[PDB]
């Protein structure tokens, strides 16, 4: 709620918000092989999770609380990781643009826009690297790139839009961007 | 011009872009009493000045080159220190609003908007503090708040006159009241 804009939480040469780095690193240390990571609700309500995003070493918390605070963080950003300026344009694309490569090309062009601080694209890259690392231990945590896209795309885009071949295309590019991180 | 956005050059808790801090501190050390500071074209062309901003100690440079790089920096920012949305609103209120105190109240409200990264207001505050320090030795450098406003308002607002006079007056007053 009081979470500052991504552009105010860090700046190059740093690669991601320091709070998001703590969350991701704690979650990867404690939950990389957890087969319900990001798929089960913890006991804590949003007000308790928000308390966590201010105050301690995060490795001290239950991994399912960290996973919920991670989702809480993405929801409480004043503007989503993928700004609506970008989402609005991607949703407007015609059926004749069928190439996932084209959607990805446009996402990168728009999000790298000078009207959008570089921090947004940097944060997304950091998240994609996290999702890719999780998908590499899928034999144990059961997380592939597509499931991760379906779980987190609504948090990254924060867009209420009726499910179309457009919304399916947003989910698909996130899927592709996770798979092709390395 | 590869100069990054103000919001990409630093973030809280830092108070201003590190490159702008280096420029300001060097200029204040070498030119605080210079009767022509910021009013003389130096020898260098824009490409040479950009080399200096795309990088070792700035005190090694001629003060008139530093002053030109300072202006070059403000000109090369992808977005001006005072965003165009803010300038556009202040200009459209020009005939109907005549009060200086109201314009100042509005500039602060608009630039502090949540849609505008905090770095812009922080940079403007840093610049105003520099301009005020210069005006304290105006008897020697001839830079008072009015002259400083006329020189730098077009760079801060990025406007090539008439509706502008209210903008210039805002900066003048903001320089004067740094306390």
Numbering used by the authors:
A (entry chain A): 113 to 167, 172 to 298
B (entry chain B): 113 to 167, 172 to 276, 280 to 298
Question: Which of the paper's sentences describe this entry?
Answer:
We crystalized the wild type bovine p85α BH domain (105–319) and solved its structure to 2.25 Å resolution. X-ray diffraction data collection and structure refinement statistics for bovine p85α (105–319) wild type is provided in Supplementary Table S1. The BH domain dimers observed within the crystal structures are mediated by reciprocal interactions between M176 from one monomer fitting into a hydrophobic pocket created by L161, 177 (Ile in human, Phe in bovine), and V181 in the other monomer. The buried surface area in the bovine p85α BH–BH crystal lattice is 535 Å2, similar to in the human p85α BH–BH crystal lattice (527 Å2).
The N-terminal domains of p85α include an SH3 domain, capable of binding to proline-rich sequences, and a BH (breakpoint cluster region homology) domain. The BH domain can bind to and regulate several GTPases including Rab5, Rac1 and Cdc42. In addition, the p85α BH domain, either alone or together with the SH3 domain, can bind to and positively regulate PTEN activity. The p85α BH domain also exhibits Rab5 GAP activity to stimulate Rab5-mediated GTP hydrolysis required to inactivate Rab5-mediated protein trafficking functions.
